[PDB]
Amino acid sequence: EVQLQQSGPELVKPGTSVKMSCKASGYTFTDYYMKWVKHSHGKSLEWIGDINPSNGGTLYNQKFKGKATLTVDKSSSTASMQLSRLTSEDSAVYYCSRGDGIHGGFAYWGQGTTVTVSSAKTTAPSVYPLAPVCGDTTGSSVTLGCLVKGYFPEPVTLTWNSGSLSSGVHTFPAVLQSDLYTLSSSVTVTSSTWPSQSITCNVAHPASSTKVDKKIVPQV
Amino acid sequence: IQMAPPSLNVTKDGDSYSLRWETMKMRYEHIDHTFEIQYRKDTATWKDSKTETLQNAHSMALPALEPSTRYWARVRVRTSRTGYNGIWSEWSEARSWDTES
Amino acid sequence: NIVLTQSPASLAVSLGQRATISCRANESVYSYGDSFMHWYQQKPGQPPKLLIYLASNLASGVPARFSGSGSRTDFTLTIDPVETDDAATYYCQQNNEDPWTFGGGTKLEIKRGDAAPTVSIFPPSSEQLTSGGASVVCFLNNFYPKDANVAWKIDGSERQNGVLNSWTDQDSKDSTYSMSSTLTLTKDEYERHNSYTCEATHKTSTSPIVKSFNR
Ligand SMILES: *[C@@H]1O[C@H](CO)[C@@H](O)[C@H](O)[C@H]1NC(C)=O
């Protein structure tokens, strides 16, 4: 299995520059090119440039010439890319991919990095348990919720019971309101199990270096 | 389309020489760059000299050489993939040097 | 600069049926014997994965449902029969002459039997409240088609202000959609009333699915 571990999420103020990375493994690092791609929000992909990890060779898309610089470090098999003169429009997801040469393309992809360019301030989220109210329809399966609001930037990792419980969950896309994000998540279990066994909601905001757990308890 | 003549230069270390060269654009990953390398002595001529080929490389160590002498060298490239080849480029400009006595 | 064009931008094909997507290039992509056109599947939240390489080759791991063919400028990615796992956006990317490029994408949505929304209602929590905040959430899960319409009723009177709902991407198993509508109020505005009702209108029934609560 080929592995492309990319760096974590970034919030950057306009005019400055980020420097994400991407550690490879599962094949000889120097045997293939590392290609980068800008997956802007809700759109198609954009090639940025490739690099021959062997001799540091480099080739760029011109639309990104002078903005992005591709680097490599063999000893630690990591390919890093730098973006300067950052601006609102640079906000997007950036992937590192590995090439093949038998077809010349993006054979293996990393999960991607989310860079947010904005002067808004990081803001810890607020997790509010959402429990059922007295009497539900004809319960068999009951649905619970967990509301995460007023946070910034993105993203926010939200799991159910350390993720052990993951079937019947529905984390919705976050909406931005007055430079503050909001999102919800509904898990649905069976009544036989709740409040039988506990059901904790695990929220996480890398940016604000925060993590919270809310055990869902029935209203009084 | 045909590539531009690569750029040659000669470097020394102690007394072991080496030919180094680069092209205009970096090769695509799904395409090899085949290089023809040849070097001789002011005395002989190109025609009468062996041209050893290489692929996707930018350098070549040189065998021991006769002290106190003036050599020459040129390179040229072609774009190849799955056996199909490209137009051999014009020879690199002849670079020469004078072996240390 | 070879400019790829994917047709159609989106299409709704029924389970078990057939799906073909076309990608036409400004100029040719063939040379050195091969056509440097590759396809890709990208699932929401998921990076792209290599589907077909060098025009007709299936990537290690792709299902026998996936097939690709085309030559100089016109290419067609065919999925037959269409599955749920296949609900994603598809891309073609040319690699003949840099700059490498991708198409605009084609998002297909698996078609299937209709499904009614499962409405759930949640009042503002004691936590949010303790800080002048009052948000009511209403979940509408696992429905199809994706045209579910909501409307909120506070003690009878309708409500348009402060309603912000989100839609999720078509599920990869039941092909059902889901959305959450969240109405936010001032803690005062909230304690000034009694019954909070959330109602959903779906092709499922001309009869609105209503769910409400009393403090
Ligand atoms: C179509 O591709 C060409 C090369 O064939 C490129 O010059 C052109 O910009 C593209 N079309 C338009 C309207 O730009």
Domains parsed from chain A with CATH numbers: 1-119 (2.60.40.10), 120-218 (2.60.40.10)
Q: How far apart, in whole angstroms, are the C-alpha atoms of residue C184 and residue A170?
A: 20
C159 Cα–ligand 1 center, Å: 51
Instruction: Report which of B46, C46, C47, C25 is spatially closest to residue C38, judged by C-alpha positions.
Output: C25
DSSP labels, C12-43: --BTTS-EEEEEEESS--EETTEE-EEEEEE-
Chain C residues close to B30, C-beta within 8 Å: 36, 95
Residues A106 and A77: their CA atoms lie apart, in Å, by 18
Burial class, A127, CB count within 10 angstroms (exposed 0-12 / middle 13-18 / buried 19+) = buried
Distance, CA of A198 to CA of B35 (rounded, Å): 69
Domain CATH code at residue C3: 2.60.40.10
Q: What token pair was written down for C213?
A: 């609560």
A101 in contact with B at a CB cutoff of 8 Å? yes
- Residue in C104, C100, C97, B30 with CA at minimum distance from that of residue A64: C100
Q: Are A38 and A51 in contact (CB under 8 A)?
A: no
Residues in contact with C2: Cβ distance below 8 Å, sequence separation at least 6, in sequence order: C25, C26, C27, C28, C29, C94, C96, C97, C101
What's the structural domain count of chain C? 2
- Closest by CA to C148, choosing from C140, C158, C157, is C140
- What's the rounded Cα separation, in Å, for the pair A66 and A85? 9
Q: Which of B42, A4, A84 is nearest to C50 (CA)?
A: A4
Same domain? C18 vs C46: yes
The architecture (CATH level 2) of B1-101 comes to Sandwich (2.60)
Q: Which amino acid appears at position C110 of this protein?
A: I
Experimental method: X-ray
Same domain? C200 vs C182: yes
| Chain B residues touching A100 at Cβ < 8 A | 29-30
- Cβ of C5 less than 6 Å from ligand 1: no
Q: Do C48 and C108 fall into the same domain?
A: yes
Quick check: A27 contacting C, CB < 8 Å?
A: no
Residues C104 and C136 in one domain: no
SS3 per residue for A71-124: EEEHHHCEEEEEECCCCHHHCEEEEEEECCCCCCCCCEECCCEEEEECCCCCEC
- In short, whether C99's Cβ falls inside 6 Å of ligand 1 is no
Question: Which among C65, C87, C112 is the end of a domain?
Answer: C112
**Is residue C140 located within the same domain as residue C191?**
yes
Is the same domain home to C72 and C21? yes
Q: Which residues of B46-72 are buried (b: 16+ CB within 10 A; e: fewer)?
A: eeeeeeeeeebeeebebeebeeeeebb
Residue contact B26–A104, C-beta within 8 A: no
CB C165 within 8 A of CB C181: yes
Instruction: Encode A172-205: b = buried (16+ Cβ within 10 Å), e = exposed.
Output: bebbeeeebbbbbbbbbbeeeebeeeebbbbbbb
Resolution (A): 2.8
Judging by DSSP bridges, how do beta strands A10-12 and A113-117 pair with one another?
A: parallel
Same domain, C127 and C175: yes
What is the domain partition of chain B in residue ranges?
1-101
Q: Which atom of ligand 1 is nearest to the CA of C2?
A: 2
The 10 Å Cβ neighbour count of residue C31 is: 15
DSSP C168: -
Range of the domain at C129: 113-215
Domain boundary among C79, C96, C112: C112
Residues C120, C71 share a domain: no
Q: Which of C121, C175, C179, C120 is closest to C148 using CA atoms?
A: C179
Of C47, C77, C112, which one is at a domain's C-terminal end?
C112
